[PDB]
Amino acid sequence: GNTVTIDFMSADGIVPGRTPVRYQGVEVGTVQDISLSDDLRKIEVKVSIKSDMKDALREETQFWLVTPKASLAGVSGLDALVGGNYIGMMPGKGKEQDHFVALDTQPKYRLDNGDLMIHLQAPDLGSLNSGSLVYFRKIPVGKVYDYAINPNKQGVVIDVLIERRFTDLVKKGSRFWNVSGVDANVSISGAKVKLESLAALVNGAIAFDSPEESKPAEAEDTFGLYEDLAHSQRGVIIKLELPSGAGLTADSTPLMYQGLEVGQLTKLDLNPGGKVTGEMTVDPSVVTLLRENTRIELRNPKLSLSDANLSALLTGKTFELVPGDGEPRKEFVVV
Amino acid sequence: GNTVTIDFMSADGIVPGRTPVRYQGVEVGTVQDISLSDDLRKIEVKVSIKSDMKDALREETQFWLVTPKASLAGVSGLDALVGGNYIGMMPGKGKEQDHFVALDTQPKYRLDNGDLMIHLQAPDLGSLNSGSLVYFRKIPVGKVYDYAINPNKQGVVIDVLIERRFTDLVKKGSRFWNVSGVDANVSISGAKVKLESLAALVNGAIAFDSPEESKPAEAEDTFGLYEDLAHSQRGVIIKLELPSGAGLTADSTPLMYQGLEVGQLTKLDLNPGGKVTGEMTVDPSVVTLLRENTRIELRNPKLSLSDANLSALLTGKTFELVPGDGEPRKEFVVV
Amino acid sequence: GNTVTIDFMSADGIVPGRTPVRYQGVEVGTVQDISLSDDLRKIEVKVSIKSDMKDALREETQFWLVTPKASLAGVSGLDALVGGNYIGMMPGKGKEQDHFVALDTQPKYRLDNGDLMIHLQAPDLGSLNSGSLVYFRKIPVGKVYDYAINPNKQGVVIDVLIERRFTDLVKKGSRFWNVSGVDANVSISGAKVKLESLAALVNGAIAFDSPEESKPAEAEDTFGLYEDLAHSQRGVIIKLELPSGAGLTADSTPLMYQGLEVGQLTKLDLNPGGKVTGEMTVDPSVVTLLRENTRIELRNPKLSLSDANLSALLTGKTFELVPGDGEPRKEFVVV
Amino acid sequence: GNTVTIDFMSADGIVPGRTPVRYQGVEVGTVQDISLSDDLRKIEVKVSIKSDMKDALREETQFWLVTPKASLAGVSGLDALVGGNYIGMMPGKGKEQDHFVALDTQPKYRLDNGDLMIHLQAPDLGSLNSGSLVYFRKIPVGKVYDYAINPNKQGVVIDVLIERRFTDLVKKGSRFWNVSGVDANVSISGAKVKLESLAALVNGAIAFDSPEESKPAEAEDTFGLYEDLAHSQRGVIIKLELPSGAGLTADSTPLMYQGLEVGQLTKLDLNPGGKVTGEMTVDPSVVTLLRENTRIELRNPKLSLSDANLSALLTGKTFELVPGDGEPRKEFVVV
Amino acid sequence: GNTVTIDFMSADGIVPGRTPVRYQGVEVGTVQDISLSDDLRKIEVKVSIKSDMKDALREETQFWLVTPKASLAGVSGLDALVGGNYIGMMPGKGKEQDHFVALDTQPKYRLDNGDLMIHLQAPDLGSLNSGSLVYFRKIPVGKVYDYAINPNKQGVVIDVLIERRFTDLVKKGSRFWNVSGVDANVSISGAKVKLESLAALVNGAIAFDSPEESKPAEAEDTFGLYEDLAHSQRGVIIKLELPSGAGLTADSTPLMYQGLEVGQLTKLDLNPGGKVTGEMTVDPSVVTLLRENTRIELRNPKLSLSDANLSALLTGKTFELVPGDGEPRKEFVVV
Amino acid sequence: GNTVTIDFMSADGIVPGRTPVRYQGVEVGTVQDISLSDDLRKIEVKVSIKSDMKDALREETQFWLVTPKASLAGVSGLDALVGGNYIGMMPGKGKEQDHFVALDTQPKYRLDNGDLMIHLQAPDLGSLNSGSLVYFRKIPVGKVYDYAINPNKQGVVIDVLIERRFTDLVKKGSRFWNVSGVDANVSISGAKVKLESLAALVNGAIAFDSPEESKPAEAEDTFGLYEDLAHSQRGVIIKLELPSGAGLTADSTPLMYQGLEVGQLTKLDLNPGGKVTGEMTVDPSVVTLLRENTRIELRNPKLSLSDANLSALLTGKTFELVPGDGEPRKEFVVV
């Protein structure tokens, strides 16, 4: 028998008879008695712990009360409905402490086994939460561990947790894209609505790709989080100096070649001085055609008297690529 | 043992044997006996309290009965299903009272820790309720504490509660916008429907932004609540003296420049004397172009024989900006 | 101990051992024994009551059996699942009665505190039920108490119940409008679907407005119930003698002025003798323009060769207002 | 103690110790012992009944087993979850019987009080079930009691049950229309979707109207069930001898008069001999205009060069009424 | 007491103390002891049965374990939650057996009473499952008993089970059509979405019709299952030798006559040799017009300068019927 | 009595008194005592096993803790709610082991009976999970057993499990297609939305076809998984050397013949050197027409003054087939 006092902000459903202290779900201690000091929420709770953990008890040890969490976000009261309320613990590398302060929520528990722990950078969290799932070829091979705002107030750092046997998958050249929420995909001549699976809608998801020839990533490497599969396309950035962005769309104006889609306009900017400039991603198979004296001009959706097509007039402006020869250059000027 | 009589309007599921008085979830008192006086809902309930709280018992002390609230709005009967019905208390700074009147609902409990407590002003409550969530970069960093109608009958004051470690986020120049409910976003050439996350739909939400260079806000500062992210855009108000608001829309008529969207018409008014005047927000990057002899004229969605575009004819009237030089002025007259 | 016989139409889950009589949730009586007379549903139930209520027992006292109501409409069996079935009572101003007849449902219980109790008149109930909520600035400040058909078979009288601290809100010039159900709001150039909050969809709601300068209403005053916020607009009725209601819509044909919407056609009638007459609500700011020699003529959505607008041709007929001078008149004739 | 044997097809959850026989929810008998005869589902169940019901036991007495009915259609196991399984009884006007056969379902129980019991005739049941609700001004004033196929195999007879205090409402000239299911109401220039309340969607509903001057209906009077509110319109049938039903719709082709809708084409037939004839309901206010030498001719949605209207060209064929004088006739010939 | 060993593949929640053997829900036997032989899933379960069933025990007797089936498809653990797990039995016409093998699922139980048991032939099962419902005039008068693939691998045989009192309904000339799932019904000038009731959506349904003059069907007669009400129309097949199926639709191209719809093209084929032939169902009222020298020619949706109709140009090709005289023939050639 | 120590990562709801070891649901062992070694999650759990399994205990024996899995994915805690938590086992072909390591999840249990076990190759998993269903003629005849990524990082191997009596169905020439998720099917002249049954939406499904004349498949044969029924069409691949892929769609551009649809363009490629080539599946009935001097030319949706069709102008480019004679060739060049 030992004596440990823990300060609680609020203690609900705790009886001095049967309120065990469960470390990893095994009873390690027992609540002795609950008292309050000077009526200022100073819930002094005496806890007798088995002697083996008393030797392993240190200062960096955190306690928390588990309640049946049936709230707006919560399922985690399965043990708490059966056995009742209890408290838990996590031993740490502290020196020594008798008087503890209980943590308001259950903290995140690192596991001992070798698991890949990598960070992501996103402009915002999106529809992701802790406990959401990580897919590869739509196979769950991990989950989102935690999330934290970087000290620069712009971004959000998300760190995820790959399983042990799938650490070979995450390469240095892997890209992570977001899959969360749902929309409607209406095109011309009929609409069909598919975005994601039903597991991703409620809590969020992150898919990723593994390139073929790359070194395996490790040890808290950062990655960018793209907001769509379409934004996660590989390719070569080509800067364009546009005349005027009249009918151009930020992510929907394509680059035709022989009638087929090759590139996609991705960014559209208004530089100071009145210079509308943008940039474009292309298929890497067509980069060999991108050389010197290579022209990019825009075609209008004109009303042709011989070929009356309804589909082209809905699309609008359309970038056309004609090939060239010479040194490969990476920027062009549209007249 | 002590004697405290509490008037209840209705007392349900209370037994004189086991009906504890739980202050913050720990048993402090016990219901002795329940009687009714002169058959006019005067439910005299005798309560014996432990002697330590009897010294701390004062006049401004409120009692309330907790029931399993499984009603139209309610989940909060989790403790009440397990243990049963009980009553609670909140001690206050009163002098002395023996005969109490029970409060009809559980009141709002201020916490002792340092948490930011700021007020919002809204024209109506919207789809917000107490217990709805507050996002920053879509990360929950607080919740709506309470709401109250100001003595002027026009507005609604909402006061929220930021967490302790996120008090650095709320600056003096922060803007709060509403995210609640859902709609459909139909544009031309296809429609895609995304408004908000699934947590915000049921109970409501409030997001906010943190500007980069501002003093940190504190101590019950007021803020305006914008009704949309689009209404929360920063910019410079530019007053326009319009000829006639024929095809103009209150929040959908844009300000083109080199084909790109710069401004957005925000307010449209009918002044007495037959003068249609409005005002416009602009991008702060383009304010340097707003000077003297700077003209704003409206372009019609005309049917051009060479460039037949379907997208422009659906939009309607369109404000065009041409730059000027001289002193920066903040108002213009459209002819 | 006393003896009270109560006739039940059907008595379910009642044991002679433990079936208490709960007045306001406190045990006042106990079911002694259940017998049936001559096999014609004459369920004679003997009830022993405490002596204090026996003095307060009178003739206008109603009893009812509470069952876990988990039916198509019901949540109200929360006490009945825990404790079991019981019966309740409401004492009244009767003389004396021993043999009672049990009421088939739980009756409506007036509270003792000062609460505003006002009547509404509606052409039908709509999607309102008892227990639906009453909003002011979308804040719940009351609920629908009861509803009853007036002896004239045309209308429905609904009486609601404002809270105690919000009796200042309801003025004499307040208007009550209905918010219940959901629809889709499709306009031209895209559609967005928002009608109401999620609490109003299931059970119904009623919002209201408080004008600024009015006497506070009291004591069972009547009010009209408008079926929409749009039908609850203030304004001045202007009678129109229309030539022929060809493309006119009952609530969608607007009154333009300088391109802006001022009025809205509200009623459209076919008088005998072949005279299509209607009436219109206007903005109260524009009533000063409504005088003698003030003309209202309708504009067609004509195909203009210079200004080709798609939005006007979808709208149809359009009332135009030109101002006049002289004595203010309240009716006009459209040629 | 008595002995009654009841044949069950299947007896589930019945213990010889505690399986009461509940007439109207009060224990009247007890299952003695369960045996099966010659392994052919002859579940002989001995039941001891109290002596008072033994005198009232007769031959036309039906027994049924109640189970927690949590199936595809069922909520009615609320008593059966708490107390357990039991059986019930309904005494009748038989002579004498000892060996009974249990009914496979719980039969319909007529109540003793004066309630109106009227029959409806419908071409099919629709989305109505027993236990669905009956509205008047959208107030529940009854429910569907039963339904049965008439011996002619064409129709379905539905008999409903009005409450006691609302028997004044049902008149001889009342019309009953169906409200069940949901659809979408898409018109031109925008669509809004409202059909019914949320209670009617799951189980069905029937609304009705009470005319002003009519005798009160009584005593199993029949009524027609219209399939819509629109089909329940009063009016005068006018037979039309149409030239050819080219663009005519069965329930959507209106009868204009001064641009306003007066009538509605309701039935459209192909008589033998190649004679397309139909019939029309009209507003009763306009029947005074229907006389001799009264012409009905159809107007085409023609493209007018001066009044270019998009709304008329979507509607199609349109019946026009011009008034006449003379004797009132009830049929016309369209040329 | 007796001894019966039953092989189980997996035995869950079975205690040697209280695991009864319930034939039709009455306790007939008790599990004595559970042992496993040579660790190869040979779960030897000893069962002591009452002596009366031991005489009736035969070789063709099947046993099965019932578990609370709360899985993807299942509600049937209502008895299993209350009493616990048990096993059941069905005696058969075998000789004698002591060592049994337990069936993996609960088999289908034929009832003793006279019920109609007829087979259906369908090209696939569709959205039907066992336990789905059978409607007549949308009244449930039976249910789907079982389903089995015929030895020819093309079809699916479904056998259903009509109630006892409705055996008069099923005639020899009855047609069975499928009602399962839901779609959207979009027509021109507005769309309204109604397919089926809410009970049919989850599990499936089958409706049927009873013709007036036909012999009553009996004794495992086969029937075709049509996939829609529209495919279940009666009529006369008329073969057509079409010139080229250019704008013709398989089930949507109608047969006009005097502007009214008479027939409906149902099948469209490409015979070898380049001969597009189809066949058509007609109204049986119009078969008298189908004779010799009767012409069927197709009308184009032409743009008429006098009658500009939007509805006809959306429909497309349209078959026209002109009558003829002479001998009735059943095939035609379209030029 | 025996002693077996098992390492757990976390042990939840385990009591040393009553925590049985259930092999296939029969109690085989009992948890003796729980200790932790040196505070590094070394949850040493002593287990006493019956002596018969102790002889059958070997080294390749896996243990796992079962918890009520009410998580994001979970129903499998039905036994665990009733009895409580327990652990299970699977004996294997090991030599001998005393100190075990508990498996983190319940492993997959191969059954002893003859069931077909075949592998599928898919480019990604799709919306399939383990426990999803396998249909034949929409009859459930198996389920997905497991899934695993092949060592080449491109694909995903899925192995399924056909029932015992349906092993005749799976032939060598069978094709497996995916049915999972839902979309919208909007076509011209109205839209109707049906994709799949209700079971497949939540968890996924896989349907298949059995051809008529093929050898029965067996013993871990591979199969391709097509992503749609339309992609699972049989036919003959015809390579096309297209001029320019201008209005051509990857899976929506058809091959007309006499107005009827015969083929469907399936793949469209941009070869290096600027050669847009594609390939097409055809009906096997038309392969006899595919010979030498057989021409495939594309028809435009031209505006014809005599036949004004709305349907053809929405479809776009359209491949036309004219037959030829000679040797059968399998590729063509479109000019």
DSSP A107-143: PP---SS--EEEEEEESS-TT--TT-EEEETTEEEEE
Question: Which residue among B10, B127, B303 places its CB closest to the CB of C25?
Answer: B10
CA nearest to D47, candidates D97, D5, D99: D5
d(CA A134, CA A10): 35
CB contact under 8 A, E183 and F193: yes
- Report yes or no on B179 lying in a domain: yes
CA nearest to E200, candidates E137, E129, E305, E248: E129
Q: Helix count (H) and strand count (E) of chain B?
A: 4, 21
Q: Which residues contact E142 (CB under 8 A, 6 or more apart)?
A: E116, E133, E134, E160, E161, E162, E163, E166
With residues binned 3-state (H G I as helix, E B as strand, rest as coil), the percentages for chain B, rounded to 5, are: 10, 40, 55
- Report yes or no on E128 lying in a domain: yes
Closest Cα in chain C, distance from residue B50 (Å)? 25
In terms of DSSP bridges, do strands F99-101 and F4-8 run parallel, antiparallel, or are they unpaired? parallel
The SS3 assignment for C318 reads strand
CA atoms within 13 A on the CB side of D153: 15
Q: Please, where are the H alpha helices in chain D?
A: 51-56, 78-82, 198-203, 310-315
Answer whether B324 touches C (CB < 8 Å). Answer: no
Question: Which residue among E25, E78, E309 places its CB closest to the CB of D68?
Answer: E78
Mutate to test the interface with D, among E137, E174, E285 (most CBs of D within 10 A): E137
Closest Cα in chain B, distance from residue C282 (Å)? 14
Q: Residue E45: how many CB atoms within 10 A of its CB?
A: 25
d(CA D153, CA E304): 48
Q: Residue A301: list chain B partners with CB under 8 A.
A: 308-309
Q: Which residues contact E269 (CB under 8 A, 6 or more apart)?
A: E276, E277, E278
Of all residues in chain B, the one with the smallest CA distance to A15 is B26
d(CA E165, CA E116): 10
With residues binned 3-state (H G I as helix, E B as strand, rest as coil), the percentages for chain A, rounded to 5, are: 10, 40, 55
Amino acid, single-letter form, for residue F52? D
The SS3 assignment for E31 reads strand
CB contact under 8 A, B13 and C82: yes
Give residue B79's domain range.
Answer: 4-101
CA nearest to B47, candidates B57, C28, C79, B77: B57
Please tell me whether residues B289 and B227 are part of one structural domain. Answer: no
Answer whether D268 touches E (CB < 8 Å). Answer: yes
Q: Do chains B and E touch (3 or more CB pairs under 8 A)?
A: no
Q: Do chains E and D touch (3 or more CB pairs under 8 A)?
A: yes
Closest Cα in chain B, distance from residue A81 (Å)? 9
Q: Which residues contact B116 (CB under 8 A, 6 or more apart)?
A: B142, B161, B162, B166, B167, B170, B217, B218
Q: Which residues contact D15 (CB under 8 A, 6 or more apart)?
A: D31
Torsion of CA A321, A325, A329, A332, to 10 degrees: -40
Amino acid, single-letter form, for residue F251? D
Please tell me whether residues A165 and A266 are part of one structural domain. Answer: no
CA nearest to D243, candidates D278, D194, D276: D276
Please tell me whether residues F14 and F30 are part of one structural domain. Answer: yes
Which uninterrupted H or E stretch holds B80?
helix B78-82
- Report yes or no on D33 lying in a domain: yes
Name the burial class of residue C117, with classes exposed (0-12), middle (13-18) and buried (19+) by CB atoms within 10 angstroms of its CB.
middle
Beta bridge partners of E159: E119, E146
d(CA C5, CA C217): 45
Q: Are C284 and C236 in contact (CB under 8 A)?
A: yes
Which uninterrupted H or E stretch holds B136?
strand B133-136
Answer whether F84 touches E (CB < 8 Å). Answer: no
CB contact under 8 A, B139 and A127: no
d(CA A171, CA A210): 6
Q: Please, where are the H alpha helices in chain A?
A: 51-56, 78-82, 198-203, 310-315
Resolution of this PDB entry, in A?
A: 3.8
Closest Cα in chain B, distance from residue C329 (Å)? 19
- Report yes or no on E88 lying in a domain: yes
Question: Which residue among E40, E149, E191 places its CB closest to the CB of F137?
Answer: E149
Of all residues in chain C, the one with the smallest CA distance to B126 is C138
Answer whether F13 touches A (CB < 8 Å). Answer: yes
Which chains border F (3 or more CB–CB pairs < 8 Å)?
A, E
Please tell me whether residues D193 and D245 are part of one structural domain. Answer: no
d(CA F49, CA A48): 33
Q: Are C300 and D307 in contact (CB under 8 A)?
A: yes
Q: Which residues contact D118 (CB under 8 A, 6 or more apart)?
A: D159, D160, D162, D170, D217, D220, D221, D222, D223
Angle at D180 between CA D179 and CA D186, to 5 degrees: 85
DSSP state of B325: -
- Report yes or no on D110 lying in a domain: no
Answer whether F93 touches E (CB < 8 Å). Answer: no
Q: Which residues contact A157 (CB under 8 A, 6 or more apart)?
A: A119, A120, A121, A122, A147, A148, A149, A150
d(CA F180, CA C142): 47
Which uninterrupted H or E stretch holds C157?
strand C156-162
- Report yes or no on C31 lying in a domain: yes
Question: What is the per-residue DSSP string for B165-223?
Answer: TTTTT-BTT-EEEEE-S----B-SSSB------HHHHHH-EEEEE--SS-PBP-SS---
Please tell me whether residues C130 and C194 are part of one structural domain. Answer: yes
E93: tokens are 């016409």
Distances in Å between the alpha carbon of A282 and those of A116, A235, A264, A286, C214?
32, 5, 7, 7, 68
Please tell me whether residues F220 and F283 are part of one structural domain. Answer: no
Q: Residue D81: list chain C partners with CB under 8 A.
A: none
d(CA A325, CA A30): 81
Q: Are A207 and A135 in contact (CB under 8 A)?
A: yes
d(CA D44, CA D101): 10
User: How many beta-carbon pairs under 8 angstroms link C with D?
Assistant: 127
B211: tokens are 């500007």
Please tell me whether residues C135 and C157 are part of one structural domain. Answer: yes
d(CA B98, CA B59): 8
In terms of DSSP bridges, do strands D99-101 and D86-90 run parallel, antiparallel, or are they unpaired? unpaired
Phi-psi region of D168 (alpha: psi -120 to 50; beta: other; left: phi over 0): alpha
CA atoms within 13 A on the CB side of B228: 7
End-to-end CA distance of chain A: 85
Interface of D with C in 214-253 (CB under 8 A): none
Residue where a domain stops, chosen among A232, A251, A272: A232
Number of domains, chain D? 3
Please tell me whether residues F68 and F21 are part of one structural domain. Answer: yes
Method used to solve the structure: cryo-EM
CB contact under 8 A, C139 and B153: no
d(CA D80, CA D12): 12
Name the burial class of residue C51, with classes exposed (0-12), middle (13-18) and buried (19+) by CB atoms within 10 angstroms of its CB.
exposed
Please tell me whether residues B94 and B161 are part of one structural domain. Answer: no
Please tell me whether residues C80 and C11 are part of one structural domain. Answer: yes
D46: tokens are 């001995």
Answer whether B129 touches A (CB < 8 Å). Answer: no
CB contact under 8 A, B260 and A272: no
Answer whether B52 touches A (CB < 8 Å). Answer: yes
Please tell me whether residues D249 and D322 are part of one structural domain. Answer: yes
Max CA separation in chain E (angstroms): 96
Long-range contacts of D284-288 (CB under 8 A, 24+ apart): D284/D234, D284/D235, D284/D236, D285/C270, D285/C272, D286/C270, D286/D257, D286/D262, D286/D321, D287/D236, D287/D328, D288/C272, D288/D328
CB contact under 8 A, C68 and D91: no
Closest Cα in chain C, distance from residue B226 (Å)? 15
Please tell me whether residues E42 and E8 are part of one structural domain. Answer: yes
d(CA C186, CA C194): 10
Q: Which residues contact B268 (CB under 8 A, 6 or more apart)?
A: B242, B245, B248, B249, B250, B276, B278, C260
d(CA E228, CA E182): 12
The SS3 assignment for D160 reads strand
d(CA D80, CA D102): 18
d(CA B6, CA A333): 83
Q: Are D290 and D282 in contact (CB under 8 A)?
A: yes
Q: Are D119 and D106 in contact (CB under 8 A)?
A: no
- Report yes or no on D267 lying in a domain: yes
Residue where a domain stops, chosen among B232, B248, B272: B232
Residue where a domain stops, chosen among D72, D101, D130: D101
- Report yes or no on E109 lying in a domain: no
Distances in Å between the alpha carbon of D244 and those of B296, E259, E260?
59, 6, 8
The phi and psi torsions of C56 (rounded to 5 degrees) equal: -90, 0
Closest Cα in chain A, distance from residue B238 (Å)? 20
CA atoms within 13 A on the CB side of E210: 22
Counting every residue written for chain D, the total comes to 335
Answer whether A79 touches F (CB < 8 Å). Answer: yes
Mutate to test the interface with D, among C186, C189, C198 (most CBs of D within 10 A): C186
Beta bridge partners of D314: none
F209: tokens are 């076809």
Amino acid, single-letter form, for residue F75? V
- Give me Rg for the CA atoms of chain F: 29
d(CA C249, CA D115): 44
d(CA A308, CA F305): 13
CA nearest to B8, candidates B43, B59, B36, B48: B43
